[PDB]
């Protein structure tokens, strides 16, 4: 309802714009500016703004709020997100979102925070013209997470974004970083087959020379992510060896990077680092982006744990309240703790179709071997001698002969620590349950202490961290 649309827009445009411009302009306060802009602003634009009041688009006023390019060609993108093709799956404005130049009414009022059109328009060797361009470009493509829109204003958005960029600056890469994430997503996330790649690589080259960490970080994640979805995995594996993640990247950037890296090492046969990277991503960044990811992360995570050699408990399923999403997985877990082969194959097959989706399919075969490995550890540990035939029946192996061969391999790996006596008709337990006997109580301390060293370093550094900014702000 246009008479009601105008209050909503004016407030929204001013509030979001004010925070991006007041922060950017200071230009030498790089750490604060980088953090505020990446996490807070983009997140504000997604979750609070859109949802607030009647009609999710508050875009038409906004285009005029700052400046993109002076003819109404670049503006046109603002109309296209509103209506063309699909029209997204957001609530669009009735009118006053005009094809060419959305709005007739400025909210600019010659501010430094809401700009002025000819005033920004002079800039092209100043950071004032590239920053404004980007903020508006970002806002327009911000609807894409929520909507999962295709071929509206995202047809020329890739090209238009390259135009905004030039040889950039360290301040300009920090604002531009927000745009880089959406640039891949429009063809990536939908999985239209197109080249998002050219641009992504190209910004990457430029940002490394200037050495702006925010920019490089975003590109590397997308490049891995794009490949895996396209089903061109080979490309993603080779990429990692050439990558370097900055150590001064922000918390969202790290979470996305870590999840994506985690799926890759899991394929290689490295479960140990794969589980840790996926868990930490969820706490590191609670984002509204994060909501789409979480179901996949837990689903993939469980199959990934079973392979490492831990069998997860029931409780873990219960707490994140996503138990239902987890539910077909939960059955696979109950099957490993019992250790019986026969149950695993049936369950995993019917369910298997769903599993293909997460990225689990490659792994799925290997989960067969964990079930038996858990059965072998229980047989050797519990008793001394039980007949080979009793074991054959219990796990539901095909033959009593089949039990021998599997037991024989397991000992070599050395996880079991038993002896199988083939001729005598039994397994002998060579192991005894202990952790104080050999050199081993020291190892037991080692692992306990080891997890701690990391926690200590983090607690202490983190404590100091707000005071580091106050110290810089000039307080003792």
């Amino acid at each position: 309802p246009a008479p009601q649309d105008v209050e909503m827009k004016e407030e929204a445009a001013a509030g979001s714009g004010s925070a991006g411009e007041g922060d950017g302009k200071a230009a030498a306060t790089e750490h604060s500016q980088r953090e505020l802009d990446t996490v807070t602003l983009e997140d504000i634009k997604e979750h609070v703004r859109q949802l607030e009041k009647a009609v999710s688009g508050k875009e038409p006023r906004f285009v005029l709020r700052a400046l993109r390019m002076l003819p109404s060609t670049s503006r046109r993108l603002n109309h296209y997100v509103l209506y063309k093709a699909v029209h997204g799956f957001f609530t669009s404005n009735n009118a006053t979102r005009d094809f060419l130049l959305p709005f007739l009414e400025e909210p600019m009022d010659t501010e430094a925070d809401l700009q002025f059109r000819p005033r920004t328009g002079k800039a092209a060797s100043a950071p004032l013209l590239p920053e404004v361009e980007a903020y508006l470009q970002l806002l327009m493509v911000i609807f894409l997470m929520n909507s999962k829109r295709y071929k509206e204003a995202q047809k020329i958005s890739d090209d238009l974004m390259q135009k905004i960029s030039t040889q950039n600056r360290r301040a300009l890469d920090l604002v531009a970083a927000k745009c880089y994430y959406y640039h891949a997503r429009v063809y990536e996330f939908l999985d239209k087959l197109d080249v998002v790649r050219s641009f992504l690589h190209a910004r990457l080259r430029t940002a490394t020379l200037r050495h702006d960490a925010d920019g490089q970080a975003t590109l590397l994640n997308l490049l891995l992510r794009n490949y895996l979805h396209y089903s061109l995995y080979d490309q993603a594996e080779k990429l990692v060896s050439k990558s370097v993640f900055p150590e001064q990247a922000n918390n969202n950037e790290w979470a996305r990077y870590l999840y994506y890296t985690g799926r890759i090492k899991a394929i290689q046969l490295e479960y140990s680092e794969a589980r840790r990277t996926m868990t930490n991503a969820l706490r590191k960044a609670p984002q509204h982006t994060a909501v789409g990811f979480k179901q996949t992360v837990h689903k993939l995570l469980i199959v990934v744990e079973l392979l490492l050699g831990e069998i997860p408990d029931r409780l873990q399923f219960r707490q994140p309240s996503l138990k239902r999403s987890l539910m077909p997985y939960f059955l696979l877990t109950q099957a490993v703790r019992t250790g019986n082969l026969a149950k695993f194959n049936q369950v995993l097959d019917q369910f298997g179709e769903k599993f293909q989706t997460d990225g689990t399919y490659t792994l799925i075969i290997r989960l067969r071997h964990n079930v038996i490995k858990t059965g072998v550890r229980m047989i050797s540990l519990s008793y001394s001698r039980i007949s080979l035939a009793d074991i054959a029946q219990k796990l539901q192996l095909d033959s009593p002969e089949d039990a021998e061969f599997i037991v024989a391999k397991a000992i070599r790996d050395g996880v079991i620590e038993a002896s199988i006596n083939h001729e005598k008709g039994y397994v002998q337990s060579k192991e005894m349950i202990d952790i104080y006997s050999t050199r081993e109580p020291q190892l037991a301390f080692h692992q306990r202490i080891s997890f701690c060293l990391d926690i200590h370093n983090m607690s202490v550094k983190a404590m100091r961290f707000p005071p580091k900014s106050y110290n810089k702000d000039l307080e003792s």
Binding site: D313, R314, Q334, R337, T338
Partner: peptide, 24 residues
């Protein structure tokens, strides 16, 4: 872990009675 309780109550009473006859 697995739900041992549902299974043990039914098994313990019934099996034990047959076991009495079978063995000491």
């Amino acid at each position: 872990n697995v739900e041992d309780d549902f299974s043990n109550q039914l098994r313990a009473e019934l099996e034990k009675h047959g076991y009495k006859m079978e063995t000491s």
